[PDB]
Write a protein that binds this ligand. Structure first.
Ligand code: HEM
Ligand SMILES: CC[C@@H](CC[C@H](CC)NC(=O)[C@H](CO)NC(=O)N(C)Cc1csc(C(C)C)n1)NC(=O)OCc1cncs1
Length: 456
């Protein structure tokens, strides 16, 4: 048993059980477990995912060292998670040299120039989202946001990876829609991933059986989807595909891996955050009116948002950020400790997963006044400098942060601008209040957010 380590290092934690470790404590969610631990062990503590020692850390300096300083030398990778197949090459999964190589090649993809070039595209599906919303605002029946936002999010993804101009909501049965939709993942507390942690010694076994967490089903029709366009569309002579093609040491059957992860990364994420935001504005009509006014002051007479226009919206940026404080989609940030180290006084042995509890740190009394309340003013220029960048980490930090940050932000904002210009979102009878979060390992709502939509 490796279960003696935190006792021996003099680190407090909940007492692990044989084989299971502390996993049974997840029955309440990463979220309440991390908050409880913080509350009763203080700044630093230790637990076991099966036989895997995880060290939680909460000190801004120490986090900065793990996330930003010793990233390259010591804390380079995330923890392996289950049988991954060819997706071992995807940037967010890759390790060491291979990761450093991929992050360089793909960095040019997420530049402001490429992003400004992507505006007219993502924006054009703002109009579709509106159109679509306009029909359902005439029904007067509760809208399921995550579904309307889902279609928008797919729509924006497809289009910025080799223009696949699909009206995703109203082409429910299109090859690109059906596959992509199914790439809704991953819950690391579901039955499957649970066993993966009580039995990591089973991963080698499933890998050799070709069993993959990214279901073979989906990855198949994308490997093949990509193969023909990549060859045909530029044989006759503005998207991630092109940007990728041009920069060719980037292997063929690694480009597919990047392509899949950008779908898997923006699809469920952009749509979830957006839902959480529209929930927040509905249950906060004041904020929503304040927002609609900012937008109308900047873009008078429903004028179409632009790149520069979007950045100019102080209050929009504040609403987005607050929503991310309350519902960070990562929940935790993790790095594997590559060799023995001494960071800000304390010793980390090689092999330990070092873990920063974002969801918990985002809700900590030491840093936030009335931390349960949705209050966008915390992010106004008056108060924002009191906000520590290593407590508030919705996009991680350091060399291994979210490569898609500015794209995520811009995308989401463009959706909000076009949507708020045209509609108001009011809660109805089916709407859950206060919103309850899911007990799983994906931070999402128990019941899908349903809201009344009214035409301005
Ligand atoms: C609102 C939506 C999003 C949120 C809240 C978000 C947040 C994050 C967070 C917290 C990390 C971990 C960083 C760390 O360990 O410090 C991350 C990693 C990453 N994200 Fe984003 N993300 C979002 C959307 C995107 C989009 C749109 C893309 C690209 C299309 C993207 C691509 C990545 C990649 C490739 C990594 C791993 C980076 C690496 O290992 O080098 N995510 N995301
Ligand atoms: C394939 C899993 C995951 C890899 C990296 C993400 C980044 C947010 N990691 C996570 O934070 C997610 C939680 O939503 N999962 C994890 O926390 N892990 C990968 C670690 C893990 C694996 S098992 C476990 C339990 C047993 C304690 N923890 N997704 C992924 O590929 O990133 C695409 C995205 C980019 N931006 C937002 S999502």
């Amino acid at each position: 048993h490796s279960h003696g380590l935190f006792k021996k290092l003099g680190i407090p934690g909940p007492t692990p059980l044989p084989f299971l470790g502390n996993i049974l404590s997840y029955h309440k969610g990463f979220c309440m477990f991390d908050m409880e631990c913080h509350k009763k062990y203080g700044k630093v503590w230790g637990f076991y995912d099966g036989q895997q020692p995880v060290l939680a850390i909460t000190d801004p300096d120490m986090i900065k060292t793990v996330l930003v300083k010793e990233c390259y030398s010591v804390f380079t990778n995330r923890r392996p998670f289950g049988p991954v197949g060819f997706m071992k090459s995807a940037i967010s999964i890759a390790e060491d040299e291979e990761w450093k190589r991929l992050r360089s090649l793909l960095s040019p993809t997420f530049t402001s120039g490429k992003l400004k070039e992507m505006v007219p595209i993502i924006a054009q599906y703002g109009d579709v989202l509106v159109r679509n919303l306009r029909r359902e605002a005439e029904t007067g029946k509760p809208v399921t946001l995550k579904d309307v936002f889902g279609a928008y999010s797919m729509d924006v993804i497809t289009s910025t990876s080799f223009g696949v101009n699909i009206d995703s909501l109203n082409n429910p049965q299109d090859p690109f829609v059906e596959n992509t939709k199914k790439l809704l993942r991953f819950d690391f507390l579901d039955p499957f991933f649970l066993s993966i942690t009580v039995f990591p010694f089973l991963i080698p076994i499933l890998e050799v059986l070709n069993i993959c967490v990214f279901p073979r089903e989906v990855t198949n029709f994308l490997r093949k989807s990509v193969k023909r366009m990549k060859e045909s569309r530029l044989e006759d002579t503005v998207d991630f595909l092109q940007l990728m093609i041009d920069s060719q040491a980037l292997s063929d059957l690694e480009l597919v891996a990047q392509s899949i992860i950008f779908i898997f990364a923006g699809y469920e994420t952009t749509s979830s955050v957006l839902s959480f935001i529209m929930y927040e504005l509905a249950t906060h009509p004041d904020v929503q009116q304040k927002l609609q006014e900012e937008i109308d002051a900047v873009l008078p007479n429903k004028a179409p948002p632009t790149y520069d226009t979007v950045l100019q919206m102080e209050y929009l940026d504040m609403v987005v950020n607050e929503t991310l404080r309350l519902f960070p989609i990562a929940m935790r940030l993790e790095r594997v400790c590559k060799k023995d180290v001494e960071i800000n006084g304390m010793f980390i042995p090689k092999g330990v997963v070092v873990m920063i509890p974002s969801y918990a740190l985002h809700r900590d009394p030491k840093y936030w006044t009335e931390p349960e309340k949705f209050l966008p003013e915390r992010f106004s220029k008056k108060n924002k400098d009191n906000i520590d960048p290593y407590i508030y980490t919705p996009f991680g930090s350091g060399p291994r942060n979210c490569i898609g940050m500015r794209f995520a932000l811009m995308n989401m904002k463009l959706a909000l601008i076009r949507v708020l210009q045209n509609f108001s979102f009011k809660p109805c009878k089916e709407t859950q209040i206060p919103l309850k979060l899911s007990l799983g390992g994906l931070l999402q709502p128990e019941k899908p957010v349903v809201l009344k939509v009214e035409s301005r």
